[PDB]
Design a protein around this ligand. Structure first.
Ligand SMILES: CC[C@H]1OC(=O)/C=C/[C@H](C)[C@@H](O[C@@H]2O[C@H](C)C[C@H](N(C)C)[C@H]2O)[C@@H](C)C[C@@H](C)C(=O)/C=C/C=C/[C@]1(O)CO[C@@H]1O[C@H](C)[C@@H](O)[C@@H](OC)[C@H]1OC
Ligand code: HEM
Ligand SMILES: [Mg+2]
Length: 394
């Protein structure tokens, strides 16, 4: 009876559903029924979403058993986002000792070179070129190859395997399983090589990482490396396609960044706030005990969807929240999460998104859609929202 069908967002674009603003106003903790899995609470105000994501009483562990609210029939379980302190905390300390802000920044010149190569290839094939296939789907996985220390000769086949892990892939289950097996075997052998002769890449640094006198096991290293790959690939790819879609359809955004390229980092933050990247809200948290939130009792065990897409568009937190203002300040958005699970690749994701906009505007300052905006084909992957193809001219 009472729960609302969720997701509210239409996948065929980046429009924030008007339902979220309505619930922010008058029903900030509400019930939703997803296409698959359990009914759940949905939390939409910036304050409340931040509160749930930062509260020790809201955990992720039950994701390992539960029939989670979701938009696809299958469930992916495990990785860092399935874990709770203290087990989560230990892995996070070790991974961040290796995966530093310094290391992320140090990849900016290689990310620029790879971005320029991808534009070179677009220019070589000629116009219109598909920005999604040729650029957005290529830069983040090649940057992960560079991050981890995959030798250059293996980037193309590593990119091919990794393509099978995207929610937009049309491959068979057996095709995807073969790609997973090859990527895991490849990464294991890469870790064996770096254990034998360390160099200055992330795999070597993960081997060497110590926390107090603790370290990552051989199997933790391999599982965490694969986890970084999936966490850092589809999201960054989709966000690149979405940011350039916005650039190409909003003349003042493009003008402002052509005129003052120094605005690019601020524009990356503002677009990360504005773009409701998720179809709905994934990764439900579970109450460990009864919690009272905005007068509503969330019972021990119940799932709670804390919508960062809605939170980032809350009129109570961001003045004129639906406006894209590249100079917006402050901008304490939740686009890279909040609390203990907050995106650990965020420094790198920011480098990649900044480099993408920098290189495309420098090289292709007239970049624009090659077809009417109403003709764009949107992904029906049901996890993130973005164009399947972006035919561009310049
Ligand atoms: C929307 C992003 C999300 O995408 C996903 O969750 C992607 C899921 C795709 C759609 C899945 O693939 C489908 O599986 C079906 C059973 C068959 C489909 N085909 C073959 C007919 C197939 O397309 C999964 C099962 C693919 C495999 C390789 C996989 O486990 C991928 C995981 C990818 C995870 C993600 O890319 C990243 O999400 C990560 O999920 C982990 C479970 C978390 O721990 C966390 O990682 C650190 C988190 O990142 C922050
Ligand atoms: C634009 C690109 C990206 C976006 C929008 C993004 C967003 C996020 C968000 C919102 C979370 C928290 C999810 C939750 O708590 O429910 C998260 C977690 C994570 N991100 Fe990202 N991310 C991006 C890029 C990357 C990259 C490049 C990497 C790695 C190289 C990465 C690695 C991870 C990992 C490992 C987690 C799980 C952290 C944990 O559970 O402790 N991300 N990301
Ligand atoms: Mg050149």
């Amino acid at each position: 009876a009472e729960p609302r069908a969720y997701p509210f967002n239409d996948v065929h674009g980046l429009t924030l559903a008007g339902r979220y603003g309505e619930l922010q106003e008058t029903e900030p903790v509400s019930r939703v029924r997803p296409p698959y899995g359990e009914e759940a609470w949905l939390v939409t105000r910036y304050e409340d979403v931040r509160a749930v994501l930062g509260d020790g009483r809201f955990v992720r562990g039950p994701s390992m058993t539960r029939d989670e609210p979701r938009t696809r029939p299958e469930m992916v379980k495990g990785g860092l986002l399935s874990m709770d302190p203290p087990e989560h905390s230990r892995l996070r300390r070790l991974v961040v000792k290796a995966f530093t802000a310094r290391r992320a920044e140090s990849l900016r010149p290689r990310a620029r070179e790879i971005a320029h190569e991808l534009v070179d290839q677009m220019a070589a094939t000629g116009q219109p070129a598909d920005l999604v296939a040729m650029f957005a789907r290529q830069l983040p996985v090649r940057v992960i190859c560079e991050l981890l220390g995959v030798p250059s000769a293996d980037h193309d086949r590593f990119t091919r395997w990794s393509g099978a892990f995207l929610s937009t892939a049309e491959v068979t289950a057996e095709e995807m399983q073969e790609a997973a097996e090859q990527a895991y075997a490849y990464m294991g052998d890469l870790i064996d090589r770096r254990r034998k002769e360390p160099t200055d890449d992330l795999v070597s640094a993960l081997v060497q990482a110590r926390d107090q006198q603790d370290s990552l096991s051989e199997q933790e290293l391999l599982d965490l490396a694969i986890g970084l790959l999936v966490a850092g690939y589809e999201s960054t790819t989709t966000q690149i396609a979405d940011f350039v879609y916005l650039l190409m359809t909003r003349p003042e955004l493009r003008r402002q960044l052509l005129d003052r390229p120094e605005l690019i980092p601020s524009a990356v933050e503002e677009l990360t706030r504005w773009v409701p990247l998720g179809v709905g809200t994934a990764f439900p948290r579970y109450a460990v005990e009864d919690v009272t939130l905005r007068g509503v009792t969330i019972r021990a065990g119940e799932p709670v969807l804390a919508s960062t897409g809605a939170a980032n568009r809350d009129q109570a937190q961001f003045p004129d929240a639906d406006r894209i203002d590249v100079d917006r300040t402050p901008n304490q958005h939740l686009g890279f999460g909040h609390g203990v699970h907050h995106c650990l690749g965020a420094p790198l994701a920011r480098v990649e998104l900044q480099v993408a906009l920098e290189v495309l505007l420098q090289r292709l300052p007239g970049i624009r859609l090659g077809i009417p905006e109403t003709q764009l084909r949107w992904s029906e992957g049901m996890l993130l929202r973005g164009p399947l193809e972006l035919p561009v001219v310049w």
